[PDB]
Scaffold this active site. Sequence first.
Site, PDB file in Angstrom:
ATOM      1  N   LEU A   1      11.985   1.071  -4.597  1.00 38.96           N
ATOM      2  CA  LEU A   1      11.295   0.612  -3.387  1.00 38.96           C
ATOM      3  C   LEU A   1      10.023  -0.188  -3.690  1.00 38.96           C
ATOM      4  O   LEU A   1       9.544  -0.914  -2.822  1.00 38.96           O
ATOM      5  CB  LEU A   1      10.951   1.805  -2.461  1.00 38.96           C
ATOM      6  CG  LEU A   1      12.114   2.587  -1.858  1.00 38.96           C
ATOM      7  CD1 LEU A   1      11.599   3.758  -1.038  1.00 38.96           C
ATOM      8  CD2 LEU A   1      12.985   1.699  -0.971  1.00 38.96           C
ATOM      9  N   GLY A   2       9.479  -0.032  -4.892  1.00 42.49           N
ATOM     10  CA  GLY A   2       8.263  -0.732  -5.307  1.00 42.49           C
ATOM     11  C   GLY A   2       7.712  -0.298  -6.646  1.00 42.49           C
ATOM     12  O   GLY A   2       8.291   0.569  -7.307  1.00 42.49           O
ATOM     13  N   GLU A   3       6.590  -0.925  -7.063  1.00 38.94           N
ATOM     14  CA  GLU A   3       5.910  -0.661  -8.341  1.00 38.94           C
ATOM     15  C   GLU A   3       4.415  -0.995  -8.289  1.00 38.94           C
ATOM     16  O   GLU A   3       3.724  -0.606  -7.350  1.00 38.94           O
ATOM     17  CB  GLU A   3       6.599  -1.404  -9.504  1.00 38.94           C
ATOM     18  CG  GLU A   3       6.583  -2.923  -9.391  1.00 38.94           C
ATOM     19  CD  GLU A   3       7.561  -3.657 -10.287  1.00 38.94           C
ATOM     20  OE1 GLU A   3       7.544  -3.421 -11.516  1.00 38.94           O
ATOM     21  OE2 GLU A   3       8.336  -4.486  -9.756  1.00 38.94           O
TER      22      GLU A   3
ATOM     23  N   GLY B   1       2.120   3.289 -10.815  1.00 39.04           N
ATOM     24  CA  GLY B   1       3.298   4.093 -10.494  1.00 39.04           C
ATOM     25  C   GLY B   1       4.437   3.304  -9.875  1.00 39.04           C
ATOM     26  O   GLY B   1       4.255   2.144  -9.489  1.00 39.04           O
ATOM     27  N   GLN B   2       5.627   3.933  -9.773  1.00 37.34           N
ATOM     28  CA  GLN B   2       6.815   3.316  -9.176  1.00 37.34           C
ATOM     29  C   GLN B   2       7.413   4.235  -8.105  1.00 37.34           C
ATOM     30  O   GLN B   2       7.357   5.457  -8.243  1.00 37.34           O
ATOM     31  CB  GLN B   2       7.859   2.911 -10.236  1.00 37.34           C
ATOM     32  CG  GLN B   2       8.457   4.061 -11.044  1.00 37.34           C
ATOM     33  CD  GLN B   2       9.536   3.667 -12.031  1.00 37.34           C
ATOM     34  OE1 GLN B   2      10.020   2.528 -12.070  1.00 37.34           O
ATOM     35  NE2 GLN B   2       9.943   4.621 -12.858  1.00 37.34           N
ATOM     36  N   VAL B   3       7.987   3.637  -7.049  1.00 35.48           N
ATOM     37  CA  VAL B   3       8.545   4.366  -5.910  1.00 35.48           C
ATOM     38  C   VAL B   3      10.054   4.133  -5.790  1.00 35.48           C
ATOM     39  O   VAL B   3      10.494   2.990  -5.866  1.00 35.48           O
ATOM     40  CB  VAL B   3       7.791   3.970  -4.602  1.00 35.48           C
ATOM     41  CG1 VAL B   3       8.360   4.687  -3.370  1.00 35.48           C
ATOM     42  CG2 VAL B   3       6.288   4.214  -4.727  1.00 35.48           C
TER      43      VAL B   3
ATOM     44  N   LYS C   1       7.417   8.982  -5.441  1.00 35.07           N
ATOM     45  CA  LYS C   1       6.501   8.258  -6.337  1.00 35.07           C
ATOM     46  C   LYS C   1       6.522   8.939  -7.688  1.00 35.07           C
ATOM     47  O   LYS C   1       6.553  10.166  -7.766  1.00 35.07           O
ATOM     48  CB  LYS C   1       5.073   8.210  -5.790  1.00 35.07           C
ATOM     49  CG  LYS C   1       4.204   7.115  -6.428  1.00 35.07           C
ATOM     50  CD  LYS C   1       2.991   6.839  -5.550  1.00 35.07           C
ATOM     51  CE  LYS C   1       2.258   5.557  -5.843  1.00 35.07           C
ATOM     52  NZ  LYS C   1       1.263   5.260  -4.769  1.00 35.07           N
TER      53      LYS C   1
ATOM     54  N   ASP D   1      -8.453  -0.355   3.428  1.00 39.52           N
ATOM     55  CA  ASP D   1      -7.577  -1.520   3.498  1.00 39.52           C
ATOM     56  C   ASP D   1      -6.578  -1.413   4.644  1.00 39.52           C
ATOM     57  O   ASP D   1      -5.374  -1.617   4.458  1.00 39.52           O
ATOM     58  CB  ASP D   1      -6.886  -1.843   2.160  1.00 39.52           C
ATOM     59  CG  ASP D   1      -6.297  -3.240   2.170  1.00 39.52           C
ATOM     60  OD1 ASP D   1      -6.831  -4.103   2.896  1.00 39.52           O
ATOM     61  OD2 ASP D   1      -5.300  -3.464   1.472  1.00 39.52           O
TER      62      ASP D   1
ATOM     63  N   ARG E   1       0.338  -4.528   7.167  1.00 43.64           N
ATOM     64  CA  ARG E   1       1.155  -4.352   5.943  1.00 43.64           C
ATOM     65  C   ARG E   1       1.041  -2.891   5.432  1.00 43.64           C
ATOM     66  O   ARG E   1       1.931  -2.440   4.727  1.00 43.64           O
ATOM     67  CB  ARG E   1       0.701  -5.382   4.863  1.00 43.64           C
ATOM     68  CG  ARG E   1       1.173  -5.147   3.421  1.00 43.64           C
ATOM     69  CD  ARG E   1       2.674  -5.345   3.258  1.00 43.64           C
ATOM     70  NE  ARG E   1       3.144  -4.951   1.928  1.00 43.64           N
ATOM     71  CZ  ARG E   1       3.576  -3.734   1.608  1.00 43.64           C
ATOM     72  NH1 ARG E   1       3.597  -2.768   2.519  1.00 43.64           N
ATOM     73  NH2 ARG E   1       3.989  -3.473   0.376  1.00 43.64           N
ATOM     74  N   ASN E   2      -0.045  -2.176   5.770  1.00 46.10           N
ATOM     75  CA  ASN E   2      -0.295  -0.765   5.386  1.00 46.10           C
ATOM     76  C   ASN E   2       0.015   0.245   6.518  1.00 46.10           C
ATOM     77  O   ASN E   2      -0.542   1.351   6.576  1.00 46.10           O
ATOM     78  CB  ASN E   2      -1.713  -0.602   4.830  1.00 46.10           C
ATOM     79  CG  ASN E   2      -1.865  -1.344   3.507  1.00 46.10           C
ATOM     80  OD1 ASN E   2      -0.964  -1.347   2.671  1.00 46.10           O
ATOM     81  ND2 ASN E   2      -2.975  -2.023   3.286  1.00 46.10           N
TER      82      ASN E   2
ATOM     83  N   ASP F   1      -0.593   4.436   2.461  1.00 43.40           N
ATOM     84  CA  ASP F   1      -1.518   4.167   1.355  1.00 43.40           C
ATOM     85  C   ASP F   1      -2.989   4.491   1.657  1.00 43.40           C
ATOM     86  O   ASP F   1      -3.892   3.748   1.279  1.00 43.40           O
ATOM     87  CB  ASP F   1      -1.331   2.710   0.884  1.00 43.40           C
ATOM     88  CG  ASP F   1      -0.016   2.464   0.148  1.00 43.40           C
ATOM     89  OD1 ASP F   1       0.500   3.418  -0.494  1.00 43.40           O
ATOM     90  OD2 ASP F   1       0.493   1.318   0.202  1.00 43.40           O
TER      91      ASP F   1
END
Length: 279
Positions: free
Chosen positions: A21-23, A24-26, A48, A146, A150-151, A164
């Site tokens: 799902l993304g990149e 730690g890495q998810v 995560k 932030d 997007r968050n 996040d």
Amino acid sequence: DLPLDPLWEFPRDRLVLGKPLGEGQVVRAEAFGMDPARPDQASTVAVKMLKDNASDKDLADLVSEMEVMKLIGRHKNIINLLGVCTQEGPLYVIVECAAKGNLREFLRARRPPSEGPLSFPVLVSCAYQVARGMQYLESRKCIHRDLAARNVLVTEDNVMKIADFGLIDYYKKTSNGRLPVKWMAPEALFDRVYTHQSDVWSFGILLWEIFTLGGSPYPGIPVEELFSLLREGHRMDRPPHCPPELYGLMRECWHAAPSQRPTFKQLVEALDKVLLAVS
Ligand SMILES: */C=C\C(=O)N[C@H]1COC[C@H]1Nc1ncc2cc(-c3c(Cl)c(OC)cc(OC)c3Cl)c(=O)n(C)c2n1
């Protein structure tokens, strides 16, 4: 390696790791019996973990993220911690997986080519949920730093979840062309001061993102030109089809003095009034 917390430990053999799902890495995963009322049922979760070549500092940051999430507690409008795998293998931090992605992409995909599906009360409801999530985080002494569309993540049921918040480089333009400085309160950008009132400013920008269906703030203005505009006290104009009730709230979030901005509690109350009136 890590201490056992029986309140949060989830058996790792009850997780089926899937798609990155993304990149730690998810990674996306299937968890069996995450809900104590449904002992063998599958649920889709986000996990995560550390990268293969992670350092002792990367471990510390991941453990720290996990501990902050434990302390913040649960709320419907935040990404919640569901469980952890700390024993007999790699560290996994298990959280809720939102099916419809981030709010920015959710809004942009619903731009009409004509009337869009996101009518005014849906957009207000979206804003209201984000403010409720921020009000919760504030009560748990969490400063986001932030806050942006997007968050915010969107569930299969269109529930808004702040993402996040468990923690950045504000000057680095992201792959999707996002410049985080555009969400920073002036006291954060110019004076390194971050408070719940600086998150209120970012919330105003997020309100603007919602009512432009994921527009990019200060449209077509380069970052160097943004600094001068902020020093002169320039503010974004009322966007198309945005009523004064909502632009007024954006302007309140953007008051130069942090003490003159509304609180997350006042924003929740104001958005609820708008929703009751229109709907
Ligand atoms: C639900 C299945 C799925 O494939 N969903 C995808 C659609 O958009 C991206 C992805 N959804 C998604 N949902 C929740 C996420 C949570 C986090 C996340 C993690 Cl893993 C942690 O770990 C401690 C902490 C968080 O905030 C405090 C968050 Cl927001 C995440 O990184 N991603 C990518 C998620 N993605």
